[PDB]
Structure formats: C-alpha cells, structure tokens
Design a binder for this molecule. Structure first.
Ligand SMILES: Cc1ncc(COP(=O)(O)O)c(CN)c1O
Ligand SMILES: Cc1ncc(COP(=O)(O)O)c(CN)c1O
Ligand SMILES: [Ca+2]
Ligand SMILES: [Ca+2]
Ligand SMILES: [Cl-]
Ligand SMILES: [Cl-]
Lengths: 369, 369
C-alpha cells in the first residue's frame, strides 16, 4: 500500500499510450523544417494548449521546464532579475518548497531584500503581514497554493486582492493542481508552477505559466526555445504526456478529489483515535490527499521503517522547515508521519494501513524511555 | 529517408524496454526511505555507472541534467562562478553550440572577460591562439570535441597539453559520444557534456561529467539532489534509459561508427560530383555521421523543402555562426545542406538521396538569375 504520492506518482497508462509514438516513430525536433519537425511542433503546441486550459490560462503563456523545481527557479530568479529596476524587495512564504526558498536565498546574496512571511499554527500564511510589509519597491510575492507537507491550502485569492496589481504573485501549484480548483484568473496568479508527475504525467517535465505582460530573464540559455525563456531541444514525448495528463485531469479531477477526500477522512478519523496523536496542518482547509499526523514519544523515521516492513510506503515530510514555521518543537516535528494519497489507492490499502498502524505505534511507544 | 539525426534521434527499442517499468511499476523517488525509494535509487546509481563507464569517467562524477543545453550551462556558468577567485578570463571556441556561447555572453555581462578562439577554414580551432592567449587568470576553456554542423573533430588532446593543468577544460561531447572515442583521460577533460538522445536514449536528460576536485556552483536550486549540484526529483525513467543507452553505446559504437562512415562516404563521393558543390568542414578529421555541403547559386532552405517533398528529411544547420567563423561569405553559408546519419539509416535511404538530390539541385539552379 503506497501512501507516498507527494514523493512520486505512477504515470497513468493512458498518458504512456499517448507518449510512446513520439519516442520511436514520430521523433522529430519541433525546430526542424520538414515533416517530422512539423508533426513534433504540432504535438508540442497541442500539449501547451491542454496545460493552459487546465488552469484557465488563456491570459498567459505556458513555458515548459524540466519540472516544478526548474519552474520555481525561473519564477523567482527570472522574474526578480528582470524586474529589479522596479524594486528589490521580495516576500516569500516561510513554508515554501526548497525550490522557492533556495532561489530566494540566492537573490539575498545578490542584494535583494527577501522577507519571509510567517504562518500560524496550522501553516496558513499571515495575510495581514503581507499587507503591512508590502512596499512600493516590492516586486514579487511567492505563496504556494497549498502545502504539500501539511496539506494546508493558502488564502491566495485574498493575497491577490492585497497586492492590488503592485507586485507579481507567484503561486507554486505543485501540490494543488488536480486536487483543488486552480484557476489563474480566480487566484490572481501572475506566475504558476505546474508539475507533470503530480498530475500522473511523466517525471522530468513541468511548466511555469506566465501572465501576459509579465517579463522574465531566462535561466537556461542556448538555442532560444520556449520563445527565448527556456532553451534546449524540446522533450516532445514528455511534453505530450504532460498535455495528456492535463486533459485527463481537467476531466477527472473533481471526482478524483472527492475520492481522495473520502479515503483521507477515513484515515484521519481513525488514526486520531490513537492516544497522543495530533494532526498537523489545517483540519478543513486542507488538500484532499494529505494526512500529516504526529505521535508523542515516537520517531517518525521509525514509523516509516516499520510501515515499510509491512509493505506500506509513507514519509516523514534538520527537522522540516514547514513544521518549524508552524511553531512545533524539535521533538514534535520529529514524530511526524506523512501519508499522501493518489489515483491508485483503494479502500483495501486504507484498511491495511488502519490495521497495521496502531500496532506499529504501540511497539515504538514501548521503546521510549 | 531521415537524415537529420543531429536534430533528433529515435529512442532505441531496447532503451524503451528498460525504461518502461520505472514509469508505472517501480515509480519511487530515490530520496524516499522505503522499498520503492530504494529501488529507484539503485536504478539511478546503476545508470550513473553506465554513463561514467562509457567515457572512462572513474576519475570524476556524473551529474544528471535535463539535457546537453542544461549541462553546458552548468559547465560554463557553474564553473566560472565558483572559480572566479582564480581569475575571470575564459576562452570559448568560435564554433561552440549556442548553449555554450549564450552562457559565455552572460558571463561577459557579469564582468568576465570572454575571448573567442578562432577557427581555420575547415572549422578547426587555432591551438596556437589558445597557447598565446592563456594567462594566469584564465580559469576555463571550452572547446567542443567535434562540431555537429560541419563534422570537424577538434584537437582536444593537444589543447589539454597546452593548458597544463592551469585552466579547466570543458569539452562539449554532444556530437562525439557514440561516434568517435571519448575517453576523458585521453582527452584531458575536466568537464564533459553528454547528451542522452544523441546516443538513442530519451530526450530531456543528459549529463555533465565533472572531474574529481573540480568545483561548481549549482544553477538549479532546491532540494539538493545530485549532491547539491542539480536539484529536482530525479527523472528515474529517463535516467534509466540514458544508462541503458550508454551501456549499448559502449558495446556497439565502434561498429556503428564504421557503418555510418561507409554511408557518409558514399554520400560525399557522389554529392561532390555535382557541379559547383563544396564540402564544409574537414574532409578527413570528421565525424562519421556528418555531410555538410554547399552549392553555388542555391538556397539551402530550398533544398530542404524540395527534399521534404520527396520524403527526405534534412537540415540547413542570420546565417550559421559556425559557417561564418570558418570564413564563408553570407551567400555561401546560405547554400548549405546538412545530412546527418544515424542508427536506422540504410543503404536504401542513401540510394534514395543520391537519386533525388541531383534533380533537386538542377531545378533550383534553373531558378537562379
Ligand atoms: C554540439 C551540441 N551541443 C549542445 C546541443 C544542445 O543540445 P539539446 O538541444 O539536446 O539540449 C546541441 C543541439 N543538438 C549540439 O549540437
Ligand atoms: C510544493 C512542491 N513544490 C515543488 C516541488 C519540486 O518538485 P520536483 O522535485 O518534482 O521538481 C515539490 C517536490 N514535490 C513540492 O512538494
Ligand atoms: Ca503588471
Ligand atoms: Ca585542478
Ligand atoms: Cl494557521
Ligand atoms: Cl581549419
């Protein structure tokens, strides 16, 4: 029973079917000026359309990347560098993925002033802080749509309203697309990170959606692909796969999200019956696929080992920067179990988890001095 | 008949077979601490071994990237930035791919002094220039192993000797691996770009091999993968495919190279019978898969169109910076046809090309005032 979807997902068989022809048969480079090139370009442009449509992205452009990490790098560094004339102040949430944080820290070394937005006890960003700290020289705010460790969905719509078309809003939607509604017009995104494998597409590809008129400096330099923003010969098969994932997700996500929530809730209801167990992240304003719980006296790493031995795959997330931002102590943060659900989980998988986990927790507790 | 291998190659069916299990079945993230993670990590480490062995790379490390473009960016920018204490002077060949040139131009904007190494009429770099221009503050030299436009193989072994362990030598081996012997110890490389699809692996992955003790700044920041040098969750299927490509290439390349040369030579011998035709690049110190010819009075773009209409795919390479570096006039550079061979070409494909091309050239000539 696999409960580590936010670490990696299987490729849907339907996505693999759409991709394969482009590996072997129709293997042209979209820049080539012959029939194989034309077919490759048509495939890319069609994929690009499927990704944009997913997120209601007609008011911007999709730029293909090698994944969410490279897309977040592009968003942070590419926007800040290009727009530094307008100011060098950036607000970044304290619970962003390291592919936003580490680029932000790089900007700090380059003379930008990066201020981290605090979160409350459930990991929600403090919107009043953003409002108080926004300045004339604030050029960029980066707040994830939802947190993939603790499940908390962020108040991106209210953040957009605060910014009032004064600073660009970058939203990392790695955790949200396919789980909750991601409509760039509703959420007021100026840049949106999208991950292919998080929607059961292939690994090794992703996108940054960029609102019309937002200008970025490329990071990956070369032959000028992606209208200059991201060079390198297009990975057509992965692009096709991601597009096919985006079209399936558009069709299926609402149903899937409701199924995940059903499973999720069964887990949370039962796990929280264990003594001295505590849910991390908001209990309600929470991604449908996320269960993050901590247990007093126990090491999360030991829970994951013990579960692995029983044929159940899970995660434990220096302790997590997200957990520390929420105000947990080192020892609380250390007792964490992350269970993340996905397309292939069944009721039987949940049954198994719920039968095995209480005994696991009971042995580990017995070991604690 | 497809003669545009240096734009894109098919994935070998044997490579696809090795990859597929990792898409759907064994889809773990190598950083996960459970059985699916362990299998994924074992696959990655095994691939990494197959790539290193291909190039005799035991004296260094393979860093996985999204392709040759990203690997060249890493080599140029990552090395120069990390090593700038030692000097800010860089020598780059005039005929390097734009994924080296454009990073070099970026360094020039950042205060590095980049000097372009000239080439002679066949596109060979001027080694005496490197020797004359090397200084105490020269930290990096980037010279491709061979040129993928004109086929010319570069005197990398003699360049290594010139440098005398004074400056790092970056060799872009996109064009050479699988075509000619690429042994990092023989050629004295400190960093080597390797492209997966150029060896019939999947698109969207590649590597920079880095000699032990050479230090680089990462460009793609995030979760710390690739020992900190290139963050992002590993694209296991593509990595596996690239490894499988590297193991096949190690086994098969000498044979394949001799077959390509046979085909290549048949083409060159016959094409050069056409009046007022001229080979670009060296006639002998030349990649086995490359035929680059120009025709007086004719537009290469028209030759490619006409060939496309006959079911033959080829290339024409502002005119090519490589051709201009070799001293061609605008009108000469504009009459170029590039035919690049590969694993699936047959004698029948060559027959077809040789039957069709003389008529193509005759019509186009008729149109010239
Ligand atoms: C010599 C060479 N180097 C680098 C690259 C960059 O390759 P890619 O577009 O596969 O990233 C190319 C393009 N084939 C090339 O010919
Ligand atoms: C919210 C979020 N954002 C960005 C990423 C970076 O993703 P990747 O490692 O697929 O490039 C991750 C890792 N899953 C994440 O959870
Ligand atoms: Ca604006
Ligand atoms: Ca040295
Ligand atoms: Cl909160
Ligand atoms: Cl020469």
């Amino acid at each position: 029973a696999y409960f580590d979807y936010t670490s990696a997902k299987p490729v849907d068989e339907r996505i693999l079917e759409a991709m394969l022809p482009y590996m072997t048969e129709s293997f042209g480079n979209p820049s080539s000026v012959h029939s194989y090139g034309f077919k490759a370009r048509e495939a890319v442009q069609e994929a690009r359309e499927k990704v944009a449509k997913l997120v209601n992205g007609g008011g911007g452009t999709v730029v293909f990347t090698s994944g969410a990490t490279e897309a977040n790098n592009l968003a942070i560094i590419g926007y800040a560098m290009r727009n530094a004339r307008k100011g060098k102040h950036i607000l970044v949430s304290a619970v962003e993925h390291m592919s936003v944080i580490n680029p932000a820290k790089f900007l700090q070394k380059q003379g930008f002033e990066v201020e981290y937005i605090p979160v409350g006890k459930y990991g929600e960003v403090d919107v009043s802080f953003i409002d108080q700290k926004l300045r004339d020289d604030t050029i960029l705010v980066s707040v994830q749509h939802a947190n993939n460790e603790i499940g908390t969905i962020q108040p991106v719509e209210e953040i957009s309203e605060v910014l009032a078309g004064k600073a660009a809003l970058h939203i990392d939607a790695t955790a949200s697309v396919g789980q909750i509604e991601v409509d760039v017009e509703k959420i007021g995104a100026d840049m949106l990170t999208i991950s292919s494998n998080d929607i059961y597409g292939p690994k090794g590809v992703g996108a940054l959606w960029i609102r019309k008129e937002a200008k970025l400096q490329p990071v990956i330099l070369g032959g000028g692909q992606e209208n200059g923003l991201r060079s390198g010969s297009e990975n057509v098969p992965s692009i096709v796969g991601f597009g096919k994932a985006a079209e399936i997700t558009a069709m299926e996500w609402r149903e899937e999200a409701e199924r995940l929530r059903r499973l999720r809730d069964r887990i949370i209801d039962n796990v929280l019956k264990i003594e001295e167990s505590y849910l991390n992240g908001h209990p309600e304003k929470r991604l449908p696929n996320n269960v993050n719980v901590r247990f007093s006296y126990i090491e999360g790493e030991s829970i994951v080992l013990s579960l692995d031995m029983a044929g159940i795959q899970a995660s434990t997330g220096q302790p997590s920067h997200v957990l520390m931002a929420c105000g947990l102590k080192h020892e609380e943060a250390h007792g964490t179990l992350l269970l993340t659900l996905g397309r292939y989980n069944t009721d039987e998988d949940v049954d198994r988890l719920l039968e095995v986990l209480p005994g696991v927790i009971e042995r580990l507790r017995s070991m604690s001095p």
